[PDB]
Amino acid sequence: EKMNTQFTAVGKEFNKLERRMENLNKKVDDGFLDIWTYNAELLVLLENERTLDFH
Amino acid sequence: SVAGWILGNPECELLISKESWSYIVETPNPENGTCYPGYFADYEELREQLSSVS
Amino acid sequence: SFERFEIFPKESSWPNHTVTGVSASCSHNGKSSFYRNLLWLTGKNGLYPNLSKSYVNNKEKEVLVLWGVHHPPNIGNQRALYHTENAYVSVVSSHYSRRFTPEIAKRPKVRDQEGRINYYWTLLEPGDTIIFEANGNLIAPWYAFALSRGFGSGIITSNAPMD
Amino acid sequence: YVNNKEKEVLVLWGVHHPPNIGNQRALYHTENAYVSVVSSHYSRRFTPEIAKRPK
Ligand SMILES: *[C@@H]1O[C@H](CO)[C@@H](O)[C@H](O)[C@H]1NC(C)=O
Ligand SMILES: *[C@@H]1O[C@H](CO)[C@@H](O)[C@H](O)[C@H]1NC(C)=O
Ligand SMILES: *[C@@H]1O[C@H](CO)[C@@H](O)[C@H](O)[C@H]1NC(C)=O
């Protein structure tokens, strides 16, 4: 339930003369992707032991 | 507005002795900006650079 | 909303310019045609009177207008369809203005055609005005687009079946 | 102008576009004017543009 959601946009398009935007857009998008993998995974691995120990 | 005051509008004369600051406070609908109409080139960059001075 | 509405009627707004301009690069069903929202303007009786039209956005919503400028590949063609050597167009608005000029030069063949049309677009506001002034090489608008942008969205590219 | 100070200086200027060729020749006595600003690493050549505009 804590996964608050909102309208999101896709990676936009750029012409060949504005490549700096494309890499900046990739860096921010990849940064969030890397964050959520480790954050989400380590949550269900740490909290799987919590429930197993609880039982 | 920043452009109106930087260009030296006849109004906005009460804020000449306010040289040093930390940031700039505007009005939600700044009216007395630039009198002669036109297109102020590189407006946004000017605001960022003038956002902080000593 | 995307109301595609006539803005410059071809039958009354250009009494002094020929409007049936066709291109072999945009053939449709085996015969030459042109765009269905723009209008290639040419001369008439060997004369090309400079044009000056205006529009006021009477509607209560934003309108989107397109237009283009044609660059002939050789000076002979330029003088043929416009009877001038140094043309100029201008498109003014309340807070928007530009002055395009044609550029003539030999270019590599693309789709069996050398000349180039540079398309441009803008937006208006309720009650705003847009004035077209030109003396040649103006591809005037023929259909505008009234739009109702709502909190943005995204564009998807795919090939999935429609359902 | 030479920036004698030991600090950055900000300078502003503008170009006036008359609405009709009659006014242009009245205040400047020429039909095709030109202005230019140059510095160590800055240079542009503005030209006036005359056209009818909304009030
Ligand atoms: C200043 O703004 C007021 C409206 O707030 C307007 O009536 C007045 O003409 C403006 N004058 C100048 C010099 O900007
Ligand atoms: C078009 O031509 C007519 C007569 O041939 C002239 O009266 C008019 O001013 C011209 N320009 C227009 C209709 O914009
Ligand atoms: C159109 O061109 C003629 C001469 O070719 C000139 O006398 C007239 O003032 C021009 N009109 C506009 C609106 O540019």
Short mmCIF file of C-alpha atoms and ligand atoms in Angstrom, two decimals:
data_model
loop_
_atom_site.label_atom_id
_atom_site.label_comp_id
_atom_site.label_asym_id
_atom_site.label_seq_id
_atom_site.Cartn_x
_atom_site.Cartn_y
_atom_site.Cartn_z
CA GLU A 1 0.00 0.00 0.00
CA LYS A 2 2.92 2.40 0.54
CA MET A 3 3.78 2.37 -3.20
CA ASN A 4 2.31 5.78 -3.91
CA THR A 5 1.73 6.20 -7.64
CA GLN A 6 1.46 9.11 -10.06
CA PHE A 7 1.34 9.72 -13.79
CA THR A 8 4.77 9.12 -15.32
CA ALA A 9 6.30 9.96 -18.70
CA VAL A 10 8.53 7.79 -20.88
CA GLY A 11 12.06 8.72 -21.89
CA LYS A 12 11.51 11.47 -24.44
CA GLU A 13 13.19 11.83 -27.83
CA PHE A 14 16.05 14.10 -28.88
CA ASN A 15 17.77 14.97 -32.13
CA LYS A 16 21.42 14.16 -32.80
CA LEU A 17 22.56 17.69 -31.84
CA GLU A 18 21.29 17.46 -28.22
CA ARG A 19 22.94 14.23 -27.11
CA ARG A 20 23.79 15.67 -23.68
CA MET A 21 20.08 15.58 -22.82
CA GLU A 22 19.81 11.91 -23.78
CA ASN A 23 22.67 10.80 -21.52
CA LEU A 24 21.43 12.98 -18.65
CA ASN A 25 17.98 11.44 -19.08
CA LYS A 26 19.56 7.97 -19.11
CA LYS A 27 21.59 8.73 -15.99
CA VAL A 28 18.55 9.78 -13.96
CA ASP A 29 16.41 6.90 -15.24
CA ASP A 30 19.15 4.34 -14.61
CA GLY A 31 19.81 5.83 -11.18
CA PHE A 32 16.24 5.21 -10.05
CA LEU A 33 16.28 1.73 -11.61
CA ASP A 34 19.43 0.82 -9.67
CA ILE A 35 18.01 2.27 -6.45
CA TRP A 36 14.71 0.40 -6.54
CA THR A 37 16.33 -2.96 -7.30
CA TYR A 38 18.52 -2.89 -4.20
CA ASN A 39 15.97 -1.13 -2.00
CA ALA A 40 13.08 -3.45 -2.88
CA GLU A 41 15.14 -6.65 -2.85
CA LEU A 42 16.89 -6.11 0.48
CA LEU A 43 13.52 -5.28 2.04
CA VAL A 44 11.94 -8.65 1.23
CA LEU A 45 15.13 -10.52 2.15
CA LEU A 46 15.48 -8.81 5.53
CA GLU A 47 11.74 -9.02 6.26
CA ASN A 48 11.48 -12.66 5.18
CA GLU A 49 13.68 -13.61 8.13
CA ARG A 50 11.58 -11.40 10.40
CA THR A 51 8.44 -13.36 9.57
CA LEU A 52 10.27 -16.71 9.64
CA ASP A 53 11.67 -15.92 13.09
CA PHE A 54 8.20 -14.75 14.13
CA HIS A 55 6.71 -18.15 13.26
CA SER B 1 9.82 41.32 -12.01
CA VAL B 2 13.53 40.65 -12.38
CA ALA B 3 13.64 41.81 -16.00
CA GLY B 4 11.55 44.89 -15.27
CA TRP B 5 13.77 45.93 -12.37
CA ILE B 6 17.12 45.06 -13.97
CA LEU B 7 16.31 47.07 -17.09
CA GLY B 8 15.46 49.99 -14.81
CA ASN B 9 11.73 50.52 -15.09
CA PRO B 10 10.59 53.94 -13.84
CA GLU B 11 8.74 52.03 -11.12
CA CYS B 12 10.52 49.62 -8.74
CA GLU B 13 12.56 52.61 -7.53
CA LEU B 14 12.20 51.62 -3.85
CA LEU B 15 14.73 48.77 -4.13
CA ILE B 16 17.98 50.45 -5.19
CA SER B 17 19.70 50.39 -1.77
CA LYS B 18 19.20 46.62 -1.31
CA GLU B 19 22.45 45.49 -2.92
CA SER B 20 23.51 42.42 -0.94
CA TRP B 21 20.97 39.67 -0.31
CA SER B 22 20.52 35.89 -0.14
CA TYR B 23 17.57 35.42 -2.52
CA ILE B 24 14.86 37.33 -4.40
CA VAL B 25 11.15 37.40 -3.52
CA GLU B 26 8.65 38.13 -6.31
CA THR B 27 4.88 38.59 -6.60
CA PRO B 28 2.68 35.79 -8.04
CA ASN B 29 1.53 38.07 -10.90
CA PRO B 30 4.27 40.69 -11.37
CA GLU B 31 2.68 43.40 -13.50
CA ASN B 32 5.12 46.32 -13.87
CA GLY B 33 7.82 44.41 -15.71
CA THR B 34 9.12 45.73 -19.04
CA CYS B 35 7.25 48.70 -20.50
CA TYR B 36 8.29 48.53 -24.16
CA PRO B 37 7.13 45.09 -25.36
CA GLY B 38 9.59 42.56 -26.72
CA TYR B 39 11.26 39.19 -26.26
CA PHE B 40 13.91 39.19 -23.51
CA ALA B 41 16.62 36.84 -24.76
CA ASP B 42 18.06 34.33 -22.28
CA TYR B 43 15.64 35.46 -19.58
CA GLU B 44 15.83 32.27 -17.52
CA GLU B 45 19.63 32.16 -17.36
CA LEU B 46 19.75 35.75 -16.11
CA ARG B 47 17.49 34.92 -13.17
CA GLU B 48 19.65 31.98 -12.09
CA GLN B 49 22.88 33.98 -12.27
CA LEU B 50 21.36 36.94 -10.41
CA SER B 51 19.75 34.66 -7.82
CA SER B 52 22.86 35.12 -5.64
CA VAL B 53 25.31 38.02 -5.44
CA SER B 54 27.43 39.71 -2.78
CA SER C 1 -10.15 18.45 -28.38
CA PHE C 2 -8.50 18.51 -31.81
CA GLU C 3 -10.96 20.50 -33.92
CA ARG C 4 -9.40 20.72 -37.39
CA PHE C 5 -11.06 23.86 -38.76
CA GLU C 6 -10.59 26.03 -41.83
CA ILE C 7 -8.58 29.16 -41.00
CA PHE C 8 -7.65 30.62 -44.43
CA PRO C 9 -10.32 29.47 -46.92
CA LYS C 10 -8.64 28.71 -50.23
CA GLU C 11 -11.61 30.05 -52.23
CA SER C 12 -11.84 33.56 -50.73
CA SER C 13 -8.59 34.44 -48.92
CA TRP C 14 -6.25 34.29 -51.97
CA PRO C 15 -8.02 36.02 -54.88
CA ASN C 16 -4.69 37.19 -56.36
CA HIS C 17 -2.50 34.07 -56.01
CA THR C 18 -2.74 30.65 -57.60
CA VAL C 19 -3.31 28.03 -54.90
CA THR C 20 -3.19 24.78 -56.93
CA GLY C 21 0.45 23.98 -56.29
CA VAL C 22 1.39 20.33 -56.69
CA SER C 23 4.59 18.34 -56.22
CA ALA C 24 5.71 15.12 -57.89
CA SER C 25 7.35 14.00 -54.62
CA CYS C 26 3.99 13.58 -52.81
CA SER C 27 2.00 11.69 -55.42
CA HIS C 28 -1.25 10.11 -54.21
CA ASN C 29 -2.88 7.22 -56.09
CA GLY C 30 -0.71 7.80 -59.14
CA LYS C 31 -1.25 11.57 -59.55
CA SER C 32 0.53 14.56 -58.07
CA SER C 33 -0.90 16.27 -54.99
CA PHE C 34 0.22 18.31 -51.99
CA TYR C 35 -0.29 18.40 -48.23
CA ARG C 36 -3.83 18.48 -46.84
CA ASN C 37 -3.16 21.26 -44.31
CA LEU C 38 -0.72 23.59 -46.13
CA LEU C 39 -0.94 25.57 -49.36
CA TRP C 40 1.79 26.28 -51.91
CA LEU C 41 1.29 29.81 -53.27
CA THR C 42 2.47 30.75 -56.77
CA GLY C 43 2.11 33.70 -59.13
CA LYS C 44 -0.69 34.74 -61.46
CA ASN C 45 -0.58 36.83 -64.65
CA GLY C 46 3.16 36.93 -64.10
CA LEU C 47 2.65 39.00 -60.93
CA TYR C 48 2.95 37.97 -57.27
CA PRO C 49 1.34 40.67 -55.10
CA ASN C 50 2.83 40.69 -51.62
CA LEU C 51 0.30 39.32 -49.14
CA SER C 52 -0.67 40.53 -45.67
CA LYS C 53 -3.29 38.53 -43.77
CA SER C 54 -4.27 38.42 -40.11
CA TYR C 55 -6.13 36.16 -37.70
CA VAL C 56 -7.66 36.63 -34.25
CA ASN C 57 -8.22 33.59 -32.04
CA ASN C 58 -11.91 34.17 -31.34
CA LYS C 59 -12.21 30.80 -29.60
CA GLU C 60 -11.75 30.36 -25.85
CA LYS C 61 -8.92 27.83 -26.23
CA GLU C 62 -5.41 27.52 -27.62
CA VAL C 63 -4.95 27.19 -31.38
CA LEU C 64 -1.97 25.65 -33.17
CA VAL C 65 -0.97 26.88 -36.63
CA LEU C 66 1.68 25.55 -39.02
CA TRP C 67 3.38 27.10 -42.03
CA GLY C 68 6.49 26.60 -44.13
CA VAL C 69 8.97 28.36 -46.39
CA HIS C 70 10.11 26.93 -49.73
CA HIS C 71 13.76 27.04 -50.82
CA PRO C 72 14.10 26.58 -54.60
CA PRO C 73 17.27 24.79 -55.75
CA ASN C 74 18.23 27.24 -58.53
CA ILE C 75 17.72 30.96 -59.07
CA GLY C 76 15.85 30.25 -62.32
CA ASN C 77 13.01 28.45 -60.56
CA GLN C 78 12.85 31.12 -57.85
CA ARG C 79 12.29 33.86 -60.43
CA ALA C 80 9.86 31.64 -62.36
CA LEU C 81 7.26 31.20 -59.60
CA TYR C 82 7.82 34.45 -57.66
CA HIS C 83 9.31 37.05 -60.06
CA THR C 84 11.84 38.19 -57.45
CA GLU C 85 15.39 37.31 -56.47
CA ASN C 86 15.47 38.21 -52.74
CA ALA C 87 12.19 37.26 -51.07
CA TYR C 88 11.30 37.48 -47.39
CA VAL C 89 8.52 36.27 -45.11
CA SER C 90 7.55 37.43 -41.64
CA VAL C 91 5.25 35.98 -38.99
CA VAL C 92 4.49 38.21 -36.02
CA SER C 93 2.45 37.66 -32.86
CA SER C 94 1.84 39.28 -29.49
CA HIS C 95 4.99 37.78 -27.93
CA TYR C 96 6.58 35.96 -30.88
CA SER C 97 8.27 37.19 -34.05
CA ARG C 98 10.66 35.89 -36.69
CA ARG C 99 11.82 36.88 -40.17
CA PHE C 100 12.76 34.00 -42.46
CA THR C 101 14.60 34.39 -45.75
CA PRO C 102 15.02 31.81 -48.53
CA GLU C 103 18.36 30.10 -49.08
CA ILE C 104 19.24 28.91 -52.60
CA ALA C 105 21.89 26.24 -53.09
CA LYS C 106 22.42 22.90 -54.82
CA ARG C 107 21.49 20.02 -52.52
CA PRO C 108 21.68 16.22 -52.76
CA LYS C 109 18.65 14.55 -54.28
CA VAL C 110 16.10 13.31 -51.74
CA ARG C 111 13.01 11.45 -52.98
CA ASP C 112 13.85 12.66 -56.49
CA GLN C 113 13.67 16.27 -55.30
CA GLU C 114 16.25 18.87 -54.30
CA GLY C 115 14.25 21.77 -52.90
CA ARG C 116 13.43 21.92 -49.20
CA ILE C 117 10.45 23.16 -47.20
CA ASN C 118 11.25 24.18 -43.62
CA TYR C 119 8.15 23.72 -41.48
CA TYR C 120 7.51 25.89 -38.43
CA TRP C 121 4.81 25.98 -35.76
CA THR C 122 3.64 28.15 -32.88
CA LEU C 123 0.81 28.59 -30.39
CA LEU C 124 -1.62 31.40 -29.58
CA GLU C 125 -3.74 32.43 -26.60
CA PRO C 126 -7.42 33.38 -26.22
CA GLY C 127 -7.86 36.64 -28.11
CA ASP C 128 -4.29 36.63 -29.44
CA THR C 129 -3.34 37.75 -32.95
CA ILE C 130 -1.02 36.36 -35.62
CA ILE C 131 -0.10 38.31 -38.76
CA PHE C 132 1.45 36.80 -41.89
CA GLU C 133 3.45 39.17 -44.10
CA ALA C 134 5.48 37.87 -47.03
CA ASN C 135 6.48 38.63 -50.60
CA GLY C 136 7.38 35.13 -51.77
CA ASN C 137 8.18 31.56 -50.79
CA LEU C 138 5.48 31.39 -48.13
CA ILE C 139 3.50 28.16 -47.74
CA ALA C 140 0.51 29.64 -45.95
CA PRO C 141 -1.58 27.61 -43.49
CA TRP C 142 -4.87 26.11 -44.63
CA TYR C 143 -5.98 24.20 -41.52
CA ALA C 144 -5.15 24.97 -37.90
CA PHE C 145 -5.56 22.82 -34.79
CA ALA C 146 -7.39 23.89 -31.64
CA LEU C 147 -5.99 21.86 -28.75
CA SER C 148 -6.88 21.26 -25.10
CA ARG C 149 -3.64 20.00 -23.52
CA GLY C 150 -4.43 18.20 -20.27
CA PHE C 151 -1.65 17.56 -17.72
CA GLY C 152 0.61 16.03 -20.38
CA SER C 153 1.03 12.39 -21.42
CA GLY C 154 3.49 10.14 -23.24
CA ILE C 155 3.98 8.67 -26.70
CA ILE C 156 4.42 4.93 -27.30
CA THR C 157 5.99 3.17 -30.28
CA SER C 158 4.91 -0.43 -30.86
CA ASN C 159 3.38 -2.85 -33.37
CA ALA C 160 0.89 -4.73 -31.19
CA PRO C 161 -2.58 -5.49 -32.59
CA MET C 162 -5.35 -3.04 -31.78
CA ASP C 163 -7.80 -4.22 -29.12
CA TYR D 1 34.89 49.79 -22.40
CA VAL D 2 37.53 47.99 -20.33
CA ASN D 3 36.53 46.25 -17.11
CA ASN D 4 39.11 47.93 -14.88
CA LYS D 5 37.55 46.43 -11.75
CA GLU D 6 38.57 43.09 -10.25
CA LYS D 7 35.02 41.76 -10.60
CA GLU D 8 32.58 40.52 -13.21
CA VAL D 9 30.39 43.20 -14.77
CA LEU D 10 26.94 42.74 -16.32
CA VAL D 11 25.94 45.04 -19.19
CA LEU D 12 22.63 45.27 -21.05
CA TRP D 13 21.61 46.77 -24.38
CA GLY D 14 18.68 46.62 -26.77
CA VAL D 15 17.74 47.04 -30.42
CA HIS D 16 14.63 48.93 -31.53
CA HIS D 17 12.45 47.57 -34.35
CA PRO D 18 10.24 50.34 -35.79
CA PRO D 19 6.83 49.21 -37.08
CA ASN D 20 6.96 51.08 -40.42
CA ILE D 21 9.73 52.17 -42.76
CA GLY D 22 8.60 55.78 -42.43
CA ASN D 23 9.44 55.95 -38.72
CA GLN D 24 12.74 54.13 -39.28
CA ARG D 25 14.00 56.78 -41.69
CA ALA D 26 12.68 59.59 -39.48
CA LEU D 27 14.85 58.86 -36.43
CA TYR D 28 17.85 57.25 -38.18
CA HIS D 29 17.97 58.50 -41.81
CA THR D 30 18.81 55.02 -43.10
CA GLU D 31 16.87 52.03 -44.40
CA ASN D 32 19.17 49.09 -43.55
CA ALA D 33 20.79 49.63 -40.16
CA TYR D 34 23.08 47.27 -38.26
CA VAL D 35 24.50 47.05 -34.74
CA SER D 36 27.26 44.85 -33.39
CA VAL D 37 28.74 43.91 -30.02
CA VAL D 38 32.10 42.18 -29.62
CA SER D 39 34.24 40.92 -26.74
CA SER D 40 37.05 38.45 -26.15
CA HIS D 41 34.79 35.39 -26.62
CA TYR D 42 31.46 36.93 -27.64
CA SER D 43 30.25 38.45 -30.91
CA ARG D 44 26.86 38.86 -32.59
CA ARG D 45 25.54 41.10 -35.37
CA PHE D 46 21.91 42.14 -34.90
CA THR D 47 19.83 43.65 -37.67
CA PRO D 48 16.46 45.43 -37.41
CA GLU D 49 13.29 43.72 -38.62
CA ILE D 50 10.36 45.87 -39.79
CA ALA D 51 6.85 44.44 -39.91
CA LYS D 52 3.30 45.20 -38.81
CA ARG D 53 2.61 43.80 -35.34
CA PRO D 54 -0.42 43.53 -33.05
CA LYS D 55 -0.80 46.39 -30.60
C1 LIG E 1 1.90 49.12 -13.76
O1 LIG E 1 0.88 48.14 -13.54
C2 LIG E 1 -0.44 48.68 -13.41
C3 LIG E 1 -1.36 47.53 -13.08
O2 LIG E 1 -0.89 46.79 -11.96
C4 LIG E 1 -0.83 49.40 -14.70
O3 LIG E 1 -2.12 49.98 -14.55
C5 LIG E 1 0.20 50.47 -15.02
O4 LIG E 1 -0.10 51.07 -16.28
C6 LIG E 1 1.60 49.88 -15.06
N1 LIG E 1 2.59 50.93 -15.29
C7 LIG E 1 3.88 50.69 -15.55
C8 LIG E 1 4.74 51.89 -15.76
O5 LIG E 1 4.32 49.54 -15.60
C1 LIG E 2 -6.19 41.78 -55.36
O1 LIG E 2 -6.51 42.32 -56.65
C2 LIG E 2 -7.58 43.28 -56.63
C3 LIG E 2 -7.84 43.67 -58.06
O2 LIG E 2 -7.20 42.78 -58.96
C4 LIG E 2 -7.19 44.47 -55.75
O3 LIG E 2 -8.28 45.38 -55.69
C5 LIG E 2 -6.83 43.99 -54.35
O4 LIG E 2 -6.35 45.08 -53.57
C6 LIG E 2 -5.76 42.91 -54.42
N1 LIG E 2 -5.35 42.45 -53.10
C7 LIG E 2 -6.06 41.72 -52.22
C8 LIG E 2 -7.46 41.32 -52.60
O5 LIG E 2 -5.58 41.40 -51.13
C1 LIG E 3 4.40 45.24 -52.31
O1 LIG E 3 5.38 45.51 -53.32
C2 LIG E 3 5.18 46.76 -54.00
C3 LIG E 3 6.23 46.84 -55.09
O2 LIG E 3 6.58 45.55 -55.56
C4 LIG E 3 5.27 47.91 -53.00
O3 LIG E 3 4.98 49.13 -53.67
C5 LIG E 3 4.27 47.70 -51.86
O4 LIG E 3 4.45 48.70 -50.87
C6 LIG E 3 4.47 46.32 -51.24
N1 LIG E 3 3.48 46.08 -50.20
C7 LIG E 3 3.76 45.47 -49.05
C8 LIG E 3 2.61 45.31 -48.10
O5 LIG E 3 4.88 45.07 -48.78
#
